Every structure is written in structure tokens, then in C-alpha cells.
Amino acid sequence: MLTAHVVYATMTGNNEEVANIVCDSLTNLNVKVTESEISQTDVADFMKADILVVCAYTYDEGAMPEEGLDFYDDLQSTDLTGKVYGVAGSGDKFYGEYFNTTVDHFDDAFKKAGATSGAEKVKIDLEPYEEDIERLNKFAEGLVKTAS
Numbered sequence: 001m002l003t004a005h006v007v008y009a010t011m012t013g014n015n016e017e018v019a020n021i022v023c024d025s026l027t028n029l030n031v032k033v034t035e036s037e038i039s040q041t042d043v044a045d046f047m048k049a050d051i052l053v054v055c056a057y058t059y060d061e062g063a064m065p066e067e068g069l070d071f072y073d074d075l076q077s078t079d080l081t082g083k084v085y086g087v088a089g090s091g092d093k094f095y096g097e098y099f100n101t102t103v104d105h106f107d108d109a110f111k112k113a114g115a116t117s118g119a120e121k122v123k124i125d126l127e128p129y130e131e132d133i134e135r136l137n138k139f140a141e142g143l144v145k146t147a148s
């Protein structure tokens, strides 16, 4: 029944770890999941899933991943009405009001595209631990219930 595409942007693996946890939780909720890195993914292919997820870092005081700028821009130009989305990220709370700003940007981009938020965005500090894992499971549960 349900499909999902999880894209991640990463440099030291934390956000790929986050994407992996989300893919696992979705798979364990009987979702067929595609997972790919953002720079190797076209929005036209991404949008074919019922559930859309971006997991991406924040850099240089609030900067988006440079390899994800095209994907980000293409996302906002696409009609994603009927799609269920969620955004998550690992970042560093030391950057204060720049903590995981990329998560906020992608959540806004999905909003302009007309997609329906399936779960509250998840902002993780550095590596995901037990609490983060439980939060990413509720995240996945929210997407499935919203999409189904």
C-alpha cells in the first residue's frame, strides 16, 4: 500500500544515521521505503512516493547543504498536493538560533509545495541517541497515520 522516499544530506554520517532510523521505523510500519542521498536524487523521482522525508544538516551558521540547494529549490516549484511530508535533522545546539535551520527551510519548502505535514519536525543534537530514536519513531508513526 504505502510508499516513502527518504533523502538525506550528510558529511559525517549523522543525518544519514537519522535517515536510516526513519527508514527502519517506516519499514516496520509496513511502508516500502526508498532511501537516497540528496545530491543523487531528482525531485521528479522523489515525489512519486506517498510519504516524503528530508533529513539534512545545517552548516556555517545556518547554511543549507550546498549539494541540496537544487533539490530544495525544485521542491518548492513542484505541486505536492496529497503528499505527506516530514523533515528531520541532526545539528549542533551550540549554534543557538541557527540550530537545525535547514530543517525549518525544508519544512517551509514542503509547505509552499502544498504537501501535508504528517509529523512535527524533529531536531536532533549531533548523534541520535535513545530519546532521539523514540522521537523518530513517533515521527514515522505520524507520517503513516497521516498518509493512511
Ligand SMILES: Cc1cc2nc3c(=O)[nH]c(=O)nc-3n(C[C@H](O)[C@H](O)[C@H](O)COP(=O)(O)O)c2cc1C
Residues within 6 Å of the ligand: 009, 010, 011, 012, 013, 014, 015, 016, 057, 058, 059, 060, 061, 062, 063, 090, 091, 092, 093, 095, 098, 099, 100, 101, 125, 126, 127
Ligand atoms: C563549521 C561548522 C558549522 C556548523 N554550523 C551549524 C549550524 O549553524 N547549525 C547547526 O545546527 N549545526 C551546525 N553545525 C553542526 C552540524 O550540523 C552537525 O555536526 C551535524 O550533526 C552534522 O551532520 P552530518 O554528520 O550528517 O554531516 C556546524 C558544524 C560545522 C563543522
Ligand code: NA
Residues within 6 Å of the ligand: 070, 073
Ligand atoms: Na536548479
